[PDB]
Amino acid sequence: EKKYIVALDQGTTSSRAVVMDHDANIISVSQREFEQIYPKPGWVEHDPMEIWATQSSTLVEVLAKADISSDQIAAIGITNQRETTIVWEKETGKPIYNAIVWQCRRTAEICEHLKRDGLEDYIRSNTGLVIDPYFSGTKVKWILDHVEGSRERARRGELLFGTVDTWLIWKMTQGRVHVTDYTNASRTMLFNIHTLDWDDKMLEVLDIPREMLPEVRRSSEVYGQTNIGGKGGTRIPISGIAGDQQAALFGQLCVKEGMAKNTYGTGCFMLMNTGEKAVKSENGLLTTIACGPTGEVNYALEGAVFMAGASIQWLRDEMKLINDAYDSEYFATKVQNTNGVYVVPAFTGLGAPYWDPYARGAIFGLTRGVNANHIIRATLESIAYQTRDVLEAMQADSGIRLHALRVDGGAVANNFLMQFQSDILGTRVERPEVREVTALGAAYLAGLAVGFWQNLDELQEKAVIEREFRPGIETTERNYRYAGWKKAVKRAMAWEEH
Amino acid sequence: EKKYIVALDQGTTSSRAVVMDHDANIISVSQREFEQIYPKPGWVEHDPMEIWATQSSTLVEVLAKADISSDQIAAIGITNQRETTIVWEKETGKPIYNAIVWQCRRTAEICEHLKRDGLEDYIRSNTGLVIDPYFSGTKVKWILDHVEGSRERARRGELLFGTVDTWLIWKMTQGRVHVTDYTNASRTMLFNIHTLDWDDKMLEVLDIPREMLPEVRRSSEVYGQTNIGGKGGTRIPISGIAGDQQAALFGQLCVKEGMAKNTYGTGCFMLMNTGEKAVKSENGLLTTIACGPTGEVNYALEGAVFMAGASIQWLRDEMKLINDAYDSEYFATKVQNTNGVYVVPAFTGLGAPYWDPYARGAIFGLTRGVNANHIIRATLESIAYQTRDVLEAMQADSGIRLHALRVDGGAVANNFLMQFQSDILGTRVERPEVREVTALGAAYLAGLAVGFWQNLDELQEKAVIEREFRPGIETTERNYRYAGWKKAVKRAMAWEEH
Ligand SMILES: O=P(O)(O)OC[C@H]1O[C@](O)(COP(=O)(O)O)[C@@H](O)[C@@H]1O
């Protein structure tokens, strides 16, 4: 009867839903894009409602199309886009303000003070994090700060805070349940990653009524259940929660320290499992929470690159330089190089390991003959460059050389990118079967959490290295190119006025 | 010293110039487009002046780049768009009306009369022509008729009639030379292909003062010279002239009865060398003048198809369905068939063998899934269908089965087209090296006329079968498909409101 696990993958640009079988086979999938609100340059919002809405309906759609019923869903996993923060009225469930997405750069001023009062370490030490508008804390504060009575009501606790998983879940339970998971919490900058609870100091400094937060639980547990109709008296359990990023790492099976992958998605996300030990970043990386071999706490080192697939979309939707008929790849391969062009995707400032919020998208070394294709390619390459960036610091931090790069996310389908990536890294890149582990991750979790499965062991046999990319450019080259990349990069930082 | 022949190819849509070496090599080439005026639908005009200006500059251009001087041009051959008619003031050399292009369906009524007073046969018998707005006569009179004092002045002979060559030359000789060649004259429907002179009844009938006509001469003789600057006192001989079509034939070296080609240009032009004997068409083809192996007269059978490259051109500029970067072919191949569609390029009415000036472009068989690619393709196919149509008339007329289609003209570079043609024909198609034999034809003639060459033989090994296409579709297919074409064709006929 209950033969399916269902994953809810609330992405940055679209909500998705995946139906999974015991054989961990994708049975059905649904997608719904939502609007990317840009109130003003460097600002990114989302509709708490639109999310919810798109996420729900899909959940429904997947099943529908597949002719599956509530009563066969063994459980539901949940992954989401991290850091993007939300605050609503507990009473009404009415946001008091749009979701402020992870890329949003507005919290910079605050970050500024933060810097100023010199917490660097505290934070790093307690959160694992780096001072950035990237993270939750700041966000919230801004909201409260921005809204009239907030703080009070917050304190009066009529006000509620949450990240995606949180929100979603709450919604799925008629606000019956208000919790998040570790992976998720570890990203707010209000959660102490060693102690494993909200950081008073943290809350203190940002000024955040504890009254606002949710119950932090384990990535794979039963948090509750939801009623979506069907044959009467059926409820589906919610037994899994990880931040997308972490979900992928899990889906990827990296549950053992030194295991890592790279996710080529909205941004680029490369994480490596640091076992049960927290590892300090010396290289401008993050220290976070991940999933033990069965969703228990673990840690990992992370490199966060804001712009990846996004760049591509931008090409397509903003620049209108490609369509979905004619691929980035298509064109990119029409030329044999950027023709010296470089693209600095600082569309949302920088990020690992730069962490500049004043940085802003730039294109370099243009000539009378550079054309679209050059650019397209250029864009595509930025991705890989960045990747290198973090990959490098990672060993630096990790103390470990990666023999090959594990990847995932649509972009990985881009053979070009792949190759390049490989070249430019001078490393074997391994492209698995199903590019969308992220969801498996969540499945696995919730699935595990409910005995659907006993352990990943069974799922060993699961991963298919569909392709393998080995380098084709020699060191010298590799280095040369990287250099320009580098050259480029700087010219973009500090761009934005404070 | 004089080492080069130069050919002027006055296209229907662009003037060209060509430089040839004694080895009959193309040294250089220049093109210059010009405006297709369409005063109203079914009408097609040209600015004599634009025709001229473009033709001249190219002549100049071609030499320039090639770094060649007047005093090295052994001689010049002229080739041009047939039937297209011009009338100007002898005094001033000012046209008194736009050039009426061969395509222009305006003289239809007049044509209607001619019919009615039953000259079918007479015309046909002396001209070898069919009754159509295609030919020159009607054209002339229409102008006359349309412009006030004309006739008189014409009788006063202050007015001059002429075809491209005619025009071009005068101009080149500063109105010092007013002539045409046979091939040309045969298209006026005022010249007797047997007698070899202006057909009195004809003029009588159209009311066309002999006064405005020119001395007819042979295709390869010295008509005079032209001053184009350079080393003081240098004149270039003009020693060759033929309707482009005929030029082409010659170029193809179809100088013996039974030899034939298929020109893929503005429209399609398939002519078969009928030796020195005029063969009557019982199949809706024309009987015309061509050149014996020495610029002597010959005859041929012809099939004129109004829309070939022009159709594409249209696809490109009007429909904007393709470009310079993305070819007819490009898309055409994106699909496996028209998906049932058919395109009847009656844009300018219908020609051989149909001869319906009231026909107009049409597209058939649309279904919801039909797309542009289909349409593009259908368009291309149209070419081949029409080819078929005439090819068969011709073999019937001719009584022989061509063992291969020899072709030429830009479109020939189109593989898809070439294949198809072949398929639908169920015949080998022989694609030669140099698609621009029209010009050669001319070169030859002129060069011939000046001893630049001694004779054709010299030029025998000049041609190369660049590609050979062989059928790949079955009689039934071949046949089925054709039908549809035929079906469609009808539906496009008689559209025009008399
Ligand atoms: O509506 P269903 O699925 O047919 O079952 C009826 C259920 O509705 C409820 O009244 C509300 O249940 P929940 O509040 O758990 O959603 C229960 O009392 C009852 O079991």
Distance A76 CA to ligand 1 centre (A): 19
Whether the CA torsion A392, A396, A402, A407 is positive or negative: it is negative
Annotated binding site of A for Zn(2+): 477
Quick one: B280 and B219 in the same domain? no
Question: Which amino acid, one-letter code, is at A141?
Answer: K
Q: Assess whether A341 and A245 both reside in one domain.
A: no
Q: How many CB atoms lie within 10 A of CB A495?
A: 15
Q: Which atom of ligand 1 is nearest to the CA of A235?
A: 3
Q: Are residues A432 and A366 in the same domain?
A: yes
Looking at ligand 1, which residue's alpha carbon is closest to its atom 2? Answer: A233
Report the half-sphere exposure of A481 (CA within 13 A, side-chain side): 25
Known binding-site residue numbers of A: 12-14, 16, 82-83, 134, 233, 235, 244-245, 266, 309, 313, 410, 414, 477
- B386 in the same domain as B417: yes
Q: Does B427 belong to an annotated binding site?
A: no
Residue B167 CA to residue B53 CA, distance in Å, equals 12
Annotated binding residue at B477? yes
- CB of residue A229 inside a 6 A radius of ligand 1: no
* d(C-alpha A341, C-alpha A365), whole Å: 5
Alpha helices, H only, A67-220: 108-116, 120-126, 136-146, 150-152, 164-172, 182-185, 200-206
Question: Residues, chain B, total?
Answer: 498
A173 and A277 assigned to the same domain? no
Determine the atom of ligand 1 nearest the C-alpha atom of A233.
3
What ligand 1 atom has the least distance to the C-alpha of A227?
16
B207 contacts B154 by C-beta, under 8 angstroms: no
Crossing angle of the two packed helices B372-398 and B309-317, in degrees rounded to 10: 170
Q: Phi first, then psi: what are they for A34, rounded to 5°?
A: -135, 155
Residue B261 bridge partners (DSSP): B271
How distant, in Å, are the alpha carbons of A6, A180, B446 from that of A232? 20, 29, 95
Q: Domain boundary residue among A192, A218, A252?
A: A252
**How much distance in Å is there from the Cα of A229 to the middle of ligand 1?**
10
Nearest protein CA to atom 6 of ligand 1, as residue: A233
B264 and B217 in a single domain? The answer is no
Question: Known binder of ligand: residue B244?
Answer: yes
Please name the residue whose Cα sits nearest to atom 18 of ligand 1: A233
Residue A274 and residue A152 in one domain:
no
Shortest-distance atom of ligand 1 to CA A229 = 3
Q: Strand A4-10 vs strand A73-80: parallel, antiparallel, or unpaired? A: parallel
Token representation of residue A198: 């909200």
Distance A233 CA to ligand 1 centre (A): 6
The CATH number of residue A381's host domain is 3.30.420.40
- Please report, as a single letter, which amino acid is at residue B144: L
Ligand 1 proximity of A233 Cβ (cutoff 6 Å): yes
- Method underlying the structure: X-ray
Regarding whether A309 and A227 lie in a shared domain, the answer is no
Compute, in angstroms, the gap from residue A230 CA to the centroid of ligand 1: 12
Intra-chain end-to-end CA distance of chain A, in Å: 58
Ligand 1 atom with minimal separation from the A225 CA? 15
Cα separation of A475 and A425, whole Å? Answer: 9
Q: Is A225 in the pocket of ligand 1 (CB under 6 A)?
A: no
Task: Judge if A341 and A200 occupy the same domain.
Answer: no
Is B13 marked as a binding-site residue? yes
Number of domains into which chain B is organized: 2
Together in a domain, A80 and A222: yes
For ligand 1, the distance from its centroid to the CA atom of residue A173, given in whole angstroms, is 12
Q: Using an 8 Å Cβ cutoff, are B336 and B370 in contact?
A: no
Per-residue b or e along A203-220, where b marks 16 or more CB atoms closer than 10 Å to that residue's CB? bebbebbebbbbebbbbb
Q: Is B226 annotated as a binding residue?
A: no
* Closest approach atom of ligand 1 to CA A176: 14
Can you give the residue range of the structural domain that contains A86? 1-252
Residue nearest to ligand 1 atom 19, measured at CA? A233
Decide: helix, strand or coil at residue A494: coil
Ligand 1 geometric centre to CA of A415 (Å):
51
Encode A11-40: b = buried (16+ Cβ within 10 Å), e = exposed: bbbbbbbbbbeeebebbbbbebebebbeee
- Taking CA atoms only, the protein residue closest to ligand 1 atom 11 is A233
Nearest-atom index, ligand 1, CA of A234:
3
Q: Mark which of B252, B271, B295 sits at the end of a domain.
A: B252
Give residue A70 CA to ligand 1 midpoint distance, Å. Answer: 14
* Residues B326 and B282 both lie in one domain: yes
Omega before B353 within 30 of 0, i.e. cis: yes
Query: Do residues A353 and A284 touch, judged by C-beta distance below 8 A?
Result: yes
Question: If you take atom 13 of ligand 1, which residue's CA is the nearest one?
Answer: A227
- List, in sequence order, the alpha helices (H) in A157-264: 164-172, 182-185, 200-206, 244-251
Tell me if B93 is assigned to a ligand binding site.
no
How distant, in Å, are the alpha carbons of A36, A42, A110, A135, B424 from that of A45? 6, 10, 18, 14, 59
Residue of the CA atom closest to atom 3 of ligand 1:
A233
Residue A232, ligand 1, Cβ within 6 A = yes
3-state DSSP percent of chain A in helix, strand and coil, to 5: 35, 25, 40
B47 CB-contact burial (10 Å; exposed 0-12 / middle 13-18 / buried 19+):
middle
The answer to whether the annotation marks B25 as part of a ligand binding site is no
For a mutational test of ligand 1's pocket, the pick from A70, A227, A231, i.e. the residue with the most ligand atoms closer than 8 A to its C-beta, is: A227
**B170 and B281 share a domain?**
no
C-alpha span between B260 and B398 (Å, rounded): 11
* B313 annotated as belonging to a binding site for a ligand: yes
Q: CA dihedral defined by A452, A456, A459, A464, rounded to 10 degrees?
A: 140
Boundary (domain end) residue, out of B197, B221, B252: B252
Which of A220, A276, A233, A158 shows the shortest CA–CA distance to A450? A220
DSSP secondary structure code for residue A397 in this structure: H
For ligand 1, atom 16, the nearest C-alpha belongs to A227
